[PDB]
Design a protein around this ligand. Structure first.
Ligand SMILES: CCCCCCCC/C=C/CCCCCCCC(=O)O[C@@H](COC(=O)CCCCCCCCCCCCCCC)COP(=O)([O-])OCC[N+](C)(C)C
Ligand SMILES: CCCCCCCC/C=C/CCCCCCCC(=O)O[C@@H](COC(=O)CCCCCCCCCCCCCCC)COP(=O)([O-])OCC[N+](C)(C)C
Ligand SMILES: CCCCCCCC/C=C/CCCCCCCC(=O)O[C@@H](COC(=O)CCCCCCCCCCCCCCC)COP(=O)([O-])OCC[N+](C)(C)C
Ligand SMILES: CCCCCCCC/C=C/CCCCCCCC(=O)O[C@@H](COC(=O)CCCCCCCCCCCCCCC)COP(=O)([O-])OCC[N+](C)(C)C
Ligand SMILES: CCCCCCCC/C=C/CCCCCCCC(=O)O[C@@H](COC(=O)CCCCCCCCCCCCCCC)COP(=O)([O-])OCC[N+](C)(C)C
Ligand SMILES: CCCCCCCC/C=C/CCCCCCCC(=O)O[C@@H](COC(=O)CCCCCCCCCCCCCCC)COP(=O)([O-])OCC[N+](C)(C)C
Ligand SMILES: CCCCCCCC/C=C/CCCCCCCC(=O)O[C@@H](COC(=O)CCCCCCCCCCCCCCC)COP(=O)([O-])OCC[N+](C)(C)C
Ligand SMILES: CCCCCCCC/C=C\CCCCCCCC(=O)O[C@@H](COC(=O)CCCCCCCCCCCCCCC)COP(=O)([O-])OCC[N+](C)(C)C
Ligand SMILES: CCCCCCCC/C=C\CCCCCCCC(=O)O[C@@H](COC(=O)CCCCCCCCCCCCCCC)COP(=O)([O-])OCC[N+](C)(C)C
Ligand SMILES: CCCCCCCC/C=C\CCCCCCCC(=O)O[C@@H](COC(=O)CCCCCCCCCCCCCCC)COP(=O)([O-])OCC[N+](C)(C)C
Ligand SMILES: CCCCCCCC/C=C\CCCCCCCC(=O)O[C@@H](COC(=O)CCCCCCCCCCCCCCC)COP(=O)([O-])OCC[N+](C)(C)C
Ligand SMILES: CCCCCCCC/C=C\CCCCCCCC(=O)O[C@@H](COC(=O)CCCCCCCCCCCCCCC)COP(=O)([O-])OCC[N+](C)(C)C
Ligand code: NA
Ligand code: NA
Ligand code: NA
Ligand code: NA
Lengths: 525, 115, 115, 63
């Protein structure tokens, strides 16, 4: 207070490298301004004193383009880490200013404080902004939540959808669904304005398109099946399947056209789609893009076949059989219109990556190790009986050990070995490791996976479902996008007509006199 | 018994069948016509034959010969072992794990539902 | 303390702060610098690192008489000290020991299997 | 713990000259005529704010 009274500059900019680090654990960033340091360090008395000073430019930007509100989003953390003080500083500085100039400001990367919060992953600050109530009339126009009407415990709120819905370029909803750099997206879509916004896009157009995409892809695989399974095997199959050749027949002709077109359609779409996200890390493609590759692979294997038919060698068949077996197993994608089968699909994904790949790795080191050890003992068969043994080679022993593990076939211990008790020793040893321990251990580790993942599979499902809704939404034309536009136009203040989202609530606990509202006549119309 | 069928089995049986019939026709599509010398050259000679034999593997019954008169044997093995990993390793054992979650939650309510 | 297994007394010594200047030289933890919530501490490594004969780190890892070693290596000066030895030389040697032992078994295999 | 045993057994094998360059810590002046080897670890703490009175260097950051 002394230094300010003596004429200290209250708008300095500490722009040094320590004040603009590149690795948290290289320094400390706060926004470079004295007001931001007092706010980012939980000093409310100094934050108030600086705002009351008349030369304090609260709307000042810095090297990163960040103003006072951008910086608080940068330093915020979850509740167990810090406290709720960043949220409280966010409120104090915004109310004292008294306008939309700060939240409207975009940084050098082209981001508002709202968009910046969705990117960096600060759910607590989002939940504050997206549901902000300022009951103080003379500051009610600074809100995003508005009580339309309330009669007793029943109330109706309005949530502004200015830069949350996908009507603009870079919305909160789009950042939330497509941000592969964070690990808490499935908490974000729980927030009420987004959650209701997903559910309505489903009820209107995304549900129906999901059923159509199923049907086109469903008949697509049936056609691949029948041209293949009922191929002209005899004649050495010169009139290859998918040919568009001799005369017609209205099922023979229709089917083979629909495939080669829809094959290219996926290849272009998934050719574009795989290119846009540009796989950076490994956890993303597994968690955000796996089904996009198999359809790219499934489509290219057809087109690879469609070349090799009349142009080159006879391995076209191998590419076509992979296309269908890949195609039919992919159908687990379209389970995600349903919650029950969708959550079930989420668990299949997890259990493979946490249990199976660990399992298959260790099992193979045993399978091939005991295999060559048992094959190395088998003498040459006498010329009388050529089939003296089933472990006569590496590939033969590895197969028979595989058969034992799956419970198929018979087991004769007399295999023309030099050392039978030693021969039994390696075999029974293999059983104890595989049959007794590893297989049963695998079941036990799944139970631990199912227990932990069951508490999160529902919200991860809505994340994957949310990606499906928006991708449908990016396809629709302009005229069809407009009629399925969300929200209704409401007058939340004087000459402030905004698009908002009506959500009804029932609250019984903390009764109060409803003083702030928009319409004194409750109910619709 | 009532709960575990509706929460685990019908989810399970649905996904298992999409694999059983999908890998079935894929493996049957590769089998050449048998030479006239030996009519029983293969057990995957048709759709219904392949779907049955894959069912036998899952329940652990019978024998398994990889020589089935196929054009592409390494490709033929690839689909078969792929079917085992999805069914034998993952889905069957995953089914046991999901029951344990069902038994845990339902055990706290089965007495009152009984009454 | 490292021998007899007293983790609470270790955690005190290994991270002791005496803020009272005129007794600050009796410390083992030292605040090098602090600006706001960011701080940088210095942990003395006199008889903790393996530069000497019988160090705290060596007792912690090789004491077969106790049953709480895996709590001890959670303590910050030791934990960071393990991670840095890995990043510099122990990680690379672990990869080499793998390679020599990996080709060692392949040779035993082939002289035998192709005998 | 098992990993720690592996690191030290490797460390007991290295020669003297190679042991010295991979020596840990930097030499710091923690007090008057008390030069010690120490280990730098950075922390971020938000809860109990205070006036930082005890320290070694008033100019924060590296170097
Ligand atoms: C007015 C009638 C419509 C007018 C014409 C508008 C034309 C709009 C044009 C849309 C795109 C057309 C080209 C296809 C895009 C290529 C992708 C592909 O092959 O599969 C597509 C097939 O799934 C679909 O849904 C597309 C079929 C047309 C949509 C239905 C009309 C619009 C909704 C009508 C309103 C209904 C509610 C009405 C209630 C009143 C996308 O499927 P996917 O699963 O996303 O992609 C597969 C890959 N993935 C799984 C890895 C993601
Ligand atoms: C993935 C993570 C796991 C990593 C663990 C790695 C393992 C580590 C430990 C390994 C232990 C060491 C074993 C190998 C060394 C000895 C081999 C030898 O002597 O020569 C053999 C070379 O091999 C072949 O020719 C292979 C033939 C196919 C059988 C094996 C396939 C199993 C793959 C597993 C399934 C999934 C594979 C998935 C990936 C492709 C010669 O073969 P043969 O039989 O004599 O052929 C000629 C005779 N014949 C006419 C009778 C045919
Ligand atoms: C079954 C065992 C008990 C099960 C319980 C498991 C626990 C015990 C596990 C024990 C591990 C191994 C058990 C192998 C079983 C006997 C096999 C055998 O005798 O093979 C052959 C000998 O060939 C050999 O190799 C004999 C064993 C060598 C030593 C094994 C122990 C390691 C000691 C190494 C020193 C380092 C250690 C030093 C201390 C630090 C003879 O067998 P055969 O040919 O079938 O006989 C028919 C006769 N015929 C040849 C005329 C045709
Ligand atoms: C329910 C929830 C799950 C839904 C999943 C959906 C599946 C998705 C994936 C689908 C993959 C695609 C496979 C089908 C398409 C190809 C078929 C083809 O080419 O023609 C075949 C038509 O089929 C038959 O004739 C059927 C004969 C019986 C075998 C199948 C029964 C098992 C059903 C499952 C058991 C439970 C059923 C319960 C309900 C009834 C021709 O048959 P064929 O063999 O050539 O016969 C003549 C030759 N013969 C003389 C040698 C015999
Ligand atoms: C993970 C563990 C398992 C999971 C469980 C799921 C397992 C799914 C797997 C199921 C079995 C798979 C094999 C079946 C196909 C072989 C058919 C065949 O060849 O035989 C006969 C045809 O049969 C048909 O055409 C089949 C008709 C449809 C199946 C009806 C029963 C479904 C189950 C109902 C019960 C449950 C329903 C639910 C409520 C109670 C005749 O054969 P053939 O005469 O020797 O030769 C054929 C020549 N011919 C056609 C010219 C005559
Ligand atoms: C076993 C594999 C390792 C297992 C580990 C699993 C991981 C790897 C999984 C791999 C997936 C598939 C593996 C199949 C195994 C080989 C089969 C084969 O060669 O069949 C035949 C070729 O026919 C083919 O179809 C060759 C493979 C085509 C490409 C497959 C990958 C997709 C690339 C598409 C581009 C899209 C992607 C582009 C990038 C975005 C030949 O085999 P055969 O006939 O038995 O040989 C005997 C010779 N004979 C013909 C003279 C009689
Ligand atoms: C300048 C270059 C080096 C100069 C020469 C120095 C020579 C130093 C001499 C070391 C010992 C040499 C003899 C072998 C000891 C016998 C033990 C054995 O069989 O396996 C050994 C093989 O594993 C190894 O790592 C040894 C290979 C040499 C180490 C690499 C050079 C030094 C580090 C370079 C820095 C790289 C990073 C650089 C970044 C800038 C130890 O493996 P293990 O797993 O401990 O023991 C197996 C049994 N156990 C599993 C039951 C415990
Ligand atoms: C549920 C899970 C399994 C689903 C799999 C699908 C069902 C089973 C599939 C088929 C029945 C198999 C029995 C033989 C009859 C084949 C007829 C045919 O068209 O054959 C041609 C293929 O035709 C095409 O590829 C045209 C593509 C569009 C229509 C496909 C037919 C089924 C569509 C709706 C299906 C309902 C799906 C549900 C709809 C919502 C070529 O073959 P063909 O030589 O002319 O055939 C006669 C040969 N025969 C005389 C030797 C017998
Ligand atoms: C052309 C070859 C086709 C061969 C198959 C044809 C027959 C069809 C067979 C198989 C396809 C059907 C199985 C998948 C079913 C749906 C998905 C599911 O259930 O969960 C997972 C399946 O798990 C994986 O994808 C794990 C990786 C190995 C899978 C092996 C089969 C397919 C790839 C073969 C290798 C080719 C490699 C060759 C080089 C490119 C989803 O995948 P994920 O993303 O890994 O899991 C996300 C985990 N998360 C929740 C933590 C985020
Ligand atoms: C071949 C393999 C096929 C691929 C897998 C197929 C999946 C297996 C099939 C069925 C599983 C059934 C399980 C019970 C569902 C109850 C839970 C639920 O979410 O209900 C929803 C179902 O109502 C809808 O309208 C949503 C789904 C419609 C789009 C699906 C089209 C594509 C799949 C067509 C497949 C059919 C053909 C299947 C046979 C070919 C309720 O509506 P909602 O709007 O979501 O509101 C949520 C309200 N709630 C949460 C409070 C309840
Ligand atoms: C091989 C021979 C036979 C073929 C096998 C094929 C089998 C598949 C056949 C058909 C497709 C079904 C696939 C499974 C769908 C998921 C199940 C489901 O949602 O369960 C839910 C139970 O609550 C219910 O309401 C489930 C009962 C609806 C189906 C009734 C039987 C009709 C289907 C025919 C089946 C009966 C006849 C049997 C024969 C077909 C549990 O889901 P959840 O996630 O816990 O949430 C639910 C709501 N909750 C939030 C309030 C708790
Ligand atoms: C028989 C024929 C096939 C061969 C079978 C042999 C299979 C093995 C093949 C090869 C060696 C791999 C062995 C398993 C490695 C450990 C798994 C692991 O880390 O799991 C972790 C998740 O999952 C992953 O981290 C793995 C996903 C990335 C790899 C993608 C597949 C490529 C490898 C090829 C496989 C795909 C293609 C399929 C075919 C090869 C879970 O671990 P966690 O402890 O929870 O901690 C993780 C991080 N966390 C702390 C943030 C949570
Ligand atoms: Na069995
Ligand atoms: Na069996
Ligand atoms: Na059997
Ligand atoms: Na349990």
């Amino acid at each position: 207070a002394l230094l300010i009274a003596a004429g200290a500059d209250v708008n300095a900019h500490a722009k040094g490298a320590f004040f603009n680090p590149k690795y948290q654990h290289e320094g400390f960033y706060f926004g470079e301004t004295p007001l931001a340091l007092a706010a980012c360090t939980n000093q409310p008395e100094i934050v108030q004193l600086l705002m009351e000073h008349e030369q304090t430019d609260i709307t000042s930007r810095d090297s990163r383009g960040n103003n006072i509100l951008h910086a608080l989003v940068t330093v915020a953390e979850d509740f167990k880490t810090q406290n709720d003080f960043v949220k409280r500083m966010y409120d104090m500085i915004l109310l004292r200013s008294g306008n939309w100039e700060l939240e409207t400001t975009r940084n050098n990367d082209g981001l508002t404080p709202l968009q910046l919060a969705a990117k960096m992953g600060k759910a607590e600050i989002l939940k504050y902004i997206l549901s902000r109530e300022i009951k103080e009339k003379r500051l009610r126009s600074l809100s995003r939540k508005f009580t339309d009407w309330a009669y007793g415990p029943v109330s109706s709120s309005l949530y502004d959808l200015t830069n949350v819905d996908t009507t603009t370029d870079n919305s909160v909803l789009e950042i939330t669904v497509y941000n592969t750099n964070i690990d808490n997206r499935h908490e974000m879509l729980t927030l009420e304005p987004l959650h209701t916004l997903l559910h309505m896009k489903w009820k209107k157009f995304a549900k129906h398109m999901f059923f159509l995409s199923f049907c086109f892809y469903f008949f697509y695989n049936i056609t691949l099946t029948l041209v293949s399974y009922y191929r002209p095997r005899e004649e050495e199959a010169i009139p290859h399947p998918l040919a568009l050749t001799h005369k017609m027949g209205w099922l023979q002709l229709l089917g083979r056209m629909f495939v080669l077109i829809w094959a290219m359609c996926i290849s272009v779409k998934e050719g574009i789609a795989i290119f846009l996200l540009r796989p950076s890390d490994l956890q993303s493609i597994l968690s955000d893009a796996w089904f996009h590759f198999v359809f790219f692979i499934q489509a290219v294997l057809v087109i690879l076949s469609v070349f090799l038919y009349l142009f080159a060698y006879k391995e076209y068949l191998a590419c076509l059989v992979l296309a269908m077996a890949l195609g039919w197993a992919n159908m687990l994608y379209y389970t995600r219109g349903f919650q029950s089968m969708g959550m079930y699909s989420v668990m299949i994904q997890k259990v493979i990556l946490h249990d199976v790949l660990k399992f298959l790795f260790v099992y193979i080191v045993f399978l091939l190790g005991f295999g060559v050890a048992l094959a190395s003992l088998i003498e040459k068969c006498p010329k009388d009986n050529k089939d003296c043994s089933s472990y006569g080679s590496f590939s033969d022993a590895v197969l028979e050990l595989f058969k034992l593990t799956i419970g198929l076939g018979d087991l004769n211990i007399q295999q023309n070995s030099k050392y039978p008790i030693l021969f039994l020793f390696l075999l029974i040893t293999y059983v104890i490791l595989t049959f007794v321990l590893l297989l049963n251990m695998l079941i036990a580790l799944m139970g631990e996976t199912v227990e932990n993942v069951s508490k999160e599979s529902e919200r991860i499902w809505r994340l994957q479902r949310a990606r499906t809704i928006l991708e449908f939404e990016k396809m629709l034309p302009e005229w069809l996008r407009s009629r399925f536009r969300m929200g209704e136009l409401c007058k939340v203040a004087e000459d402030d007509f905004r698009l908002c989202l009506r959500i009804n609530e029932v609250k019984w606990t903390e009764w109060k006199t409803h003083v702030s509202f928009l319409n004194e006549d409750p109910g619709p119309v």
